Design a protein around this ligand. Structure first.
Ligand SMILES: *[C@@H]1O[C@H](CO)[C@@H](O[C@@H]2O[C@H](CO)[C@@H](O)[C@H](O)[C@H]2NC(C)=O)[C@H](O)[C@H]1NC(C)=O
Ligand SMILES: *[C@@H]1O[C@H](CO)[C@@H](O[C@@H]2O[C@H](CO)[C@@H](O)[C@H](O)[C@H]2NC(C)=O)[C@H](O)[C@H]1NC(C)=O
Ligand SMILES: *[C@@H]1O[C@H](CO)[C@@H](O[C@@H]2O[C@H](CO)[C@@H](O)[C@H](O)[C@H]2NC(C)=O)[C@H](O)[C@H]1NC(C)=O
Ligand SMILES: *[C@@H]1O[C@H](CO)[C@@H](O[C@@H]2O[C@H](CO)[C@@H](O)[C@H](O)[C@H]2NC(C)=O)[C@H](O)[C@H]1NC(C)=O
Ligand SMILES: *[C@@H]1O[C@H](CO)[C@@H](O[C@@H]2O[C@H](CO)[C@@H](O)[C@H](O)[C@H]2NC(C)=O)[C@H](O)[C@H]1NC(C)=O
Ligand SMILES: [Zn+2]
Ligand SMILES: [Zn+2]
Ligand SMILES: [Zn+2]
Ligand SMILES: [Zn+2]
Ligand SMILES: [Zn+2]
Ligand SMILES: [Zn+2]
Ligand SMILES: [Zn+2]
Ligand SMILES: [Zn+2]
Ligand SMILES: [Zn+2]
Ligand SMILES: [Zn+2]
Lengths: 346, 346, 346, 346, 346
């Protein structure tokens, strides 16, 4: 025939096609097979508990009214503007905060109609999805980001969503994240929303992201350790140098206070302790105990010669005991925090 | 019949339906039963005095012109695009700063028409609602967020809003807030706007949110207490160490000044004192009195031996009196601030 | 008759009504009576010199072509969607930076047509209006925010704007501002724009806002005073304690420098001095003169015993003279700044 | 006749008017006379190198097909909605980053048709125009902001842009800028874009803006000078006070480092030196040389009495030489920077 | 003929033209020749790993159905509004985060139809393109920004994209960047996307940008060097001045810590070391070793005269060895970092 006539013949007034009626109106529910292709991944903000994604959302379903045989071609890669003249599933993202299409030059849309009536519907989307994050074990945590594909108007008696058996989630090659590693395996679950308006279909993916500790070591693990070592210099400073040892205790304690507040600058105001909070608390306790060590030496040395060697013994004991107890803490902290991270994500 | 014909028969030119006319035009006012489902809750900013919500707004009313009997089906879950061909209430949010719909894939809308003429109208909305906050008792406060549903064009003689008798407000399971606890009980009030243009219907919910103090203890309650203890080390420092005790008083006072200004960084510029302001003022008064204590010891010790034991007596008295008076203040501050919080929200 | 027929009969093709023609086309100019209702007030930013408002804009004018008598009803509260089929004034805000309507559920619009032809047109608007601010006397200033309602296309020969005789401006009950007090009285002026395109009508309101000083006292008035008192401790510190008195002068001067820069953090980069700048300059001069006082005592004490009592006399004189001169400055500063604020706003 | 009939008679199907055809299709090019009225000016950000303006753009051209004689009126101030039914020039701004119209109540548009066929077309626009800035001589610089009005689709053979002979640029009375002075004179140039698609018309204005130095004197010129004077106190401090003079050198050098980094906080990361960078570098060199002066006095004083008066001579020489050399630098810096600013803008 | 009739004759119902059908429907694929003109370049943010561009995108292809001979004119520069009535390629940008058109006064679009059927289609676009950046060698790095032009709906059997043989990329004259130099040469590659939906055409440019080091030298290369020199003053400070040398070591170490954290303020949280991180680590190691040098001198000097000249020998050796080893590090650091930058970009 001609390319234009076939398009407006299969659907329209002459054929009787109605886009407001689901394909099998009073029969079995429509089964929509979905699969996504992640084009980009980033903007993971813990303060707002969300992340931004850019995906190619593909949907496959069978429409018996769109089946054709006369036209010679097998598939039919048609124009996007007609997408309003056909029935489409009312998919929506349950945990979506913001979303939009793309019209950079034309509509970033695709539609194919096969001979048997199968419809492939691909679309480009930018999504801002909410992600509740557990920040206990914060510099060393594995977050799980979810993506729920839910129907809004049709129940399970009308619309059912299914993930493709092969490759429901595909990630673009070379897609890296500056802060996390995206695990190769993905979890495909079966959500089902139960409202007072009825039952609604839902499908869900889970992405596992491990936080990289290279930034946090050079940002607040090594500089705080350096402050603890800098506090240990006072044990070798001469005893009568009171403005020297006291200023050494003070600058280290106040710096540890500012570094402790600086470790939560980019984090939400949660109300539970974290692993970095435990490390900051122990380092602050160590520098404060070093200052209390000199406050005791300064008090013991003036009680009037037993008191000259008794105060010097505290300095000699603190020279070896302060790094040994800090090493024992470092062993227990790092070992138990590399033990909890081997726990299964599931 | 056929699915398409019934939809355009009940309403349209042939039936005579007009979407610009309320159902009972010159009779009793239309009663709209409303109930909301909170999908997300967050973005509670004290600086802008607002919070962001994402709800499913359901509206129920009876339209006698939409009653049908011939079609076999009980309910009629129809397509959203037709929503312009029917009459809908002109609901609007009185305390709304910004609002928008959702069109992530299709319209996030739902409409059902029953046999008797009842219309269920569900919609997805993102709202930025203004919330006036009282920050007296700030680290330990219970805020009340409101949501007013008001008609804009119709008076009480035409439109009346009512909350559903069962479950007007439903919260999604597992919805947590990083900063607040959402109380299970909700207050359903009856606002009524009186303008010079007439009387207008209004309904209102109240959400009670208790601020969690876990963040604020580790952020500005314990570090300021540590500065007060660090200031108490000077009482044990040797008397003639003037650059040591003076630098101890100075660094503690200047740090208390910076922490006091740091406690109001994320707060609006209100003009009344708060509980954290009282705590910061007392801690600043304590470290400043410790420095004045050494300024008196340094002045008394040089008046030329009575003056050697008289100045030492002030040090010995301040060693026990400074923590005892600080403990008495801590008891009165915490007790009275755990007494005011047991006061009923209502 | 029927409700629908009357609406499309009064205006349309059959009646001959044209929305592109002003009511009295070649007669007296159309007089539009305007009055606003402020729903919210806030977002007053000095850096961008603007403020955000949310108002109900009401407009009243007479259209002889819309007069009816046959229909029984007195007023006619009709549907908003028809608002395009009638003539409306081309009002616009002269000092508007950004503006938008509201479509949270439906159009936030209202239109009534009376028997004689009077048209009441209410609309909801969010406005970001520019406000030039004079920040001399900044912590204690009264700003005047303006709102100009101007016609864009019609001259005085066609369109005239007037304020309602009773209640042109109404403020919602309980509307408070965290930073300012909104004065109860308002000024209704008569602007008139003179361009090269002709003469254009304009009406203007003026809002008077007094800045509350409760925040600024605890933020940068009392902490700077505390630094000045902390600088006065050096006069009581022992004379030979050079690292003590010198470090006392240095930390106070550098802190006064940081507080002076901190007082202009949220302010625009204006090029005239302010009241807080005068207070910061005098406090910085006081702490710098205290350090120069010890620099003179340290120089006088070593000139080799007259020089021992001569240097001690400067300390004794500075003990009483430094707070007395600071008290005299505080009296003159506060008195003259409570005198300028009693000056009439007009 | 009637007002409505004339509007649709001059243009439309009956007359044969086509909005897709330029007035003189195959004759001389259309000459469009342009003039702008600046309503607001601000948001000048050096980091993004742009500024925001709000203008009334007026365009005048002759359309022979719009000439009328029968209708009685001289000019014809018509309704804005019809603006799509006539031909308009395809003006666009070459250096525009973002732009939008205004629809606060209606379209902020104006169109007049005269008897001879002249068309006056006024529109309200908000523009974010890019401005390349030269920041050498930064606290004391005169920037030149440009505005290019270019045609996008028509060449010089079809469309020519011209500035009005009288008042091409008019500024609203009382329009001030918090950071700059807008020079009264303006430069009207003749740009002409040469692409591979052909030749295109362009016209350009230039605004000269002088930066006000009142903010920068009190922000980083006087506080850095105060640090230099504070560093000169060490020359009067006693020689053996090593922790006093050393702490005086250290706090001044570290403060000069922080003030130097603070001077470029709101500036883009350019790679050439500026006048404030030269001032910061010389002030940092002065305080660092004062510390090296005490490092030399402390080294010379202990070489074992010639060495007691030799080290004291360096202190006495540095007491007068350090302010004299700083005064000579201040004279040469300010004189040459008030000489370069008298250079013609052109 | 007449200008209007020809436009609607070549395409439309009478001619049979369909915009939903590609020109050669069942023949060879359509070859689209593309070339871009960069109007502006900037907003290069490393934190979000993106950059903003403003380009003129030109597309050339042959449409046999648009060939004409009767009309006299060679080319046909027509009106933009008709652009919907013709077939256009479905180009889209693969690495695009956000994009929009421009409608400042009219559509910023251009279309020309030649006699043989060639179509030139120019459009103005603002793009926010993602750019993965390697920040190893960060203050001295050459980034490569890419721009992929990909088809969304048509495969290689239908649509093929090609770069123009002459001048695919043209940069506007005088276009400078405050932070980078845009290399004159550009790389034109051949991407080809392989999805599960089929094969898709793609073309790609590469821009090479060299970071300018003028800002980073005065921002964090020279101030850190000054801290290292300031730490070398302690070697000349007198030995028994313990509060002087200790405070000199402390302020320098804490300042180096704050400058090290300040060097990564505007950078993303990557987990690999950079060149500035290596420089900051070595400078921190140098000032910390200077403090350990005085901690050893202070310990050796009190062991009770051999111990008086033995501790003085460490001071004399450290006076020359500390700058010599720092000079050797500076030679190896700068030489190897000027060697890696001569490596070919390709
Ligand atoms: C959609 O999928 C469901 C589930 O596989 C199909 O329902 C089954 O259909 C088969 C074929 O008639 C029956 O034998 C089963 O008993 C059905 N199971 C259930 C639970 O209903 C359904 O037919 C599919 N829809 C379409 C249009 O093919
Ligand atoms: C909407 O609700 C109101 C209040 O219940 C109804 O008004 C009452 O209607 C009953 C039934 O006719 C009367 O007996 C009462 O006297 C009415 N009370 C008032 C205060 O008006 C109203 O009828 C309802 N509207 C509809 C359409 O059912
Ligand atoms: C709009 O208001 C103006 C001013 O009150 C009216 O103009 C006056 O109209 C009266 C009644 O005819 C005359 O007596 C006056 O001489 C007019 N004054 C001026 C300055 O024109 C005008 O008529 C009003 N418009 C309408 C439609 O009522
Ligand atoms: C637009 O302006 C140009 C330049 O003034 C006009 O071109 C001139 O027209 C006059 C009158 O016919 C001629 O004598 C000149 O030789 C023309 N000069 C050039 C360079 O073309 C043009 O006619 C104007 N267009 C209209 C419609 O008036
Ligand atoms: C688009 O370009 C391709 C590649 O040059 C063209 O394909 C070639 O066409 C010539 C001419 O018929 C043949 O001789 C070659 O064998 C073709 N090569 C391939 C790989 O197909 C194609 O014809 C061009 N399309 C149009 C419409 O001109
Ligand atoms: Zn896009
Ligand atoms: Zn898993
Ligand atoms: Zn959405
Ligand atoms: Zn309650
Ligand atoms: Zn709204
Ligand atoms: Zn007034
Ligand atoms: Zn506007
Ligand atoms: Zn000029
Ligand atoms: Zn634009
Ligand atoms: Zn290359």
């Amino acid at each position: 025939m001609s390319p234009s006539d076939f398009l407006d013949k299969l659907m329209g007034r002459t054929s009787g096609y109605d886009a407001r009626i689901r394909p099998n109106f009073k029969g079995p529910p429509v089964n929509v097979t979905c699969n996504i292709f992640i084009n980009s991944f980033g903007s993971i903000a813990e303060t707002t508990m969300d992340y931004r994604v850019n995906i190619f959302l593909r949907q496959k379903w069978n429409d018996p009214r769109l089946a054709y045989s006369e036209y010679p071609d097998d598939s039919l890669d048609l124009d996007p503007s007609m997408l309003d003249s056909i029935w489409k599933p009312d998919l929506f993202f349950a945990n979506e905060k913001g979303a939009n299409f793309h019209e950079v030059t034309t509509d970033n849309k695709l539609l194919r109609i096969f001979k048997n009536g199968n419809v492939l519907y691909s679309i480009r989307l930018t999504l801002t999805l909410s992600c509740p994050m557990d920040l206990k074990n914060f510099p060393m945590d594995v977050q799980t980001c979810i993506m729920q594909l839910e129907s809004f108007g049709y129940t399970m008696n009308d619309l059912i969503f299914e993930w493709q058996d092969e490759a429901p989630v595909q990630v673009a090659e070379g897609l890296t994240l500056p802060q996390f590693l995206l695990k190769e395996e993905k979890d495909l679950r079966y959500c089902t929303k139960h409202y007072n308006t009825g039952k609604f279909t839902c499908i869900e993916v889970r992405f596992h992201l491990e936080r990289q500790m290279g930034y946090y070591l050079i940002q607040m693990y090594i500089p705080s350790l350096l402050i603890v070592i800098l506090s240990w210099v006072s044990f070798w400073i001469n005893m009568d140098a009171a403005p020297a040892r006291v200023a050494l205790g003070i600058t280290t304690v106040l710096t540890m206070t500012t570094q402790s507040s600086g470790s939560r600058a980019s984090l939400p105001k949660v109300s539970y302790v974290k692993a970095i909070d435990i490390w900051m608390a122990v380092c602050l306790l160590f520098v404060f105990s070093a200052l209390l060590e000199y406050a005791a030496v300064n008090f013991v040395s003036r009680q009037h010669k037993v008191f000259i060697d008794r105060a010097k013994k505290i300095d000699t004991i603190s020279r070896a005991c302060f790094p040994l107890a800090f090493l024992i803490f470092n062993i227990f902290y790092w070992v138990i925090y590399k033990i909890l991270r081997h726990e299964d994500i599931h």
